[PDB]
């Protein structure tokens, strides 16, 4: 057996993670969280700085960034909405060796939401985690194990799947 054309080897999105690393805390971070909750429909979570850097103007445990994880159809919809801004053209140096890819928009109004002067514009970070069926093996509590080499997601498979499913171009 060991057929590469097996039903359970199908690539599909595991999760899409939206990151806005506003360098400060307060009103700007709160409005970035509002933007993320608007786009995803889910309450985002705020990340604290791991340590203090004077150059970046951050200190340890200061709430810096906000991010949210979306899975399922909503992740697909947000991903294609963001690929529209990228006009469906990623680079070969956007796909990791583990088969994940990401891009970054620069203005969040290009996605297609209403603009408010009070909110302003925030850039946004898109990352897609790819994976086949059976990843629960690496995430379950009991009998947790690792995924076999053939079942792993890599750069070439993800690039080809992205080109096929979106008719987009990966600029090598």
């Amino acid at each position: 057996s060991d057929k590469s054309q097996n039903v359970m080897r199908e690539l599909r999105i595991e999760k899409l993670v939206l990151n806005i690393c506003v360098g400060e805390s307060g009103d700007r971070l709160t409005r970035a969280a509002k933007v993320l909750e608007q786009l995803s429909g889910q309450t985002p979570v705020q990340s604290k700085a791991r340590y203090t850097v004077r150059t970046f103007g951050i200190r340890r445990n200061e709430k810096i960034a906000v991010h949210v994880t979306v899975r399922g159809p909503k992740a697909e919809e947000i991903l294609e909405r963001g690929l529209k801004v990228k006009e469906y053209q990623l680079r070969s140096k956007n796909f990791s060796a583990t088969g994940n890819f990401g891009f970054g928009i620069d203005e969040h109004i290009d996605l297609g939401i209403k603009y408010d002067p009070s909110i302003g514009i925030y850039g946004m970070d898109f990352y897609v985690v790819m994976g086949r069926a059976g990843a629960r093996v690496t995430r379950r509590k009991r009998a947790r194990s690792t995924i076999g080499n053939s079942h792993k997601t890599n750069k070439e498979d993800t690039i080809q799947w992205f080109k096929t499913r979106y008719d987009a171009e990966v600029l090598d």
Binding site: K141, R142, A143, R144, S145
Partner: protein, 292 residues
């Protein structure tokens, strides 16, 4: 640019965990706390209620630990339930209750504590512990071992807990993990627990789904449809089974279509065998020669 990590020194100094910890199956912290017995109760064993859930089965075993390995006292599986009248949903919360009741009754039959320590014969969902009878042997004490499975209020392991407790076993527990426990108002709503014991949640899903999404109802509750089992007669399936479980809790092994020797002979055909030293030496010599 970076150092290769998996060196021979990395493997030489690696201390592999316990075999059953590397399999991710035994929590040895919890196992030590469960198994270890008071040293002044010298050879008296502690009895564990091992409750494990697979994708298709509920396994309930009464176990005592020894140096050569654990020893099963009795065991009740969920696939025994069709004998008692429960054929579908062999992993319900109610199937968990039935398996717990079955293992409790079977253990008490093995010990001889049947007429004494009958249990809760009229299941109303009230929290209760098996109290000892004065001037008589104490109830069989058993401790729940849920393994790696998380403790949540409403989990199915505590269904086996409640069934075994109602079956006459003394199993120490609290009612704050049962379905129907109000955490804000720290009392148990026994009505909802009784609902869960007799498949009430499943019956309500059948009734609620049938009038809203009939197509999904046809796929999810197929077996009930071809069995002509509606919601209103779901409860009796459990209610009778309990009675049946109490009528004859003895273990009847499945009659085996083949003998042990036939099974072994059949299985041995599909088992690759290790190459002899000479075989792999010849392979190495051939690979050397074909390298010229």
């Amino acid at each position: 640019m970076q150092k290769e990590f998996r060196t021979s020194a990395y493997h030489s100094r690696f201390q592999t965990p316990f075999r059953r910890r590397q399999e991710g199956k035994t929590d040895y912290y919890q196992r030590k706390r469960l198994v270890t017995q008071h040293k002044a109760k010298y050879n008296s064993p502690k009895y564990r209620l091992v409750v494990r859930f697979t994708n298709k089965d509920i396994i309930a075993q009464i176990v005592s630990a020894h140096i050569t390995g654990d020893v099963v006292f009795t065991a009740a599986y969920a696939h025994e339930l069709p004998r008692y009248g429960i054929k579908y949903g062999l992993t319900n919360w109610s199937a968990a209750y039935a398996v717990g009741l079955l293992v409790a009754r079977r253990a008490l039959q093995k010990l001889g504590l049947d007429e004494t320590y009958t249990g809760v014969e009229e299941v109303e969902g009230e929290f209760e512990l098996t109290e000892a009878v004065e001037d008589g042997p104490r109830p069989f004490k058993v401790f729940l071992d849920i393994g790696l499975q998380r403790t949540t209020t409403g989990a199915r392991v505590f269904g086996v807990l409640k069934g075994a407790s109602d079956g006459g076993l003394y199993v120490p527990h609290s009612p704050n993990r049962f379905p129907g426990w109000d955490i804000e108002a720290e009392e148990l709503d026994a009505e909802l627990l009784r609902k869960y014991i007799f498949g009430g949640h499943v019956a309500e899903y059948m009734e609620e789904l049938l009038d809203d999404d009939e197509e999904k109802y046809k796929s999810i509750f197929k077996n009930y449809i071809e069995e002509e089992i509606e919601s209103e007669d779901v409860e009796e399936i459990y209610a009778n089974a309990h009675e049946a479980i109490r009528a004859d809790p003895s273990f009847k092994p499945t009659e085996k279509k083949f003998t042990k020797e036939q099974y072994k002979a059949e299985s041995k055909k599909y088992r690759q065998q290790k190459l002899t030293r000479a075989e792999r030496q010849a392979k190495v010599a051939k690979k050397i020669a074909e390298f010229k």
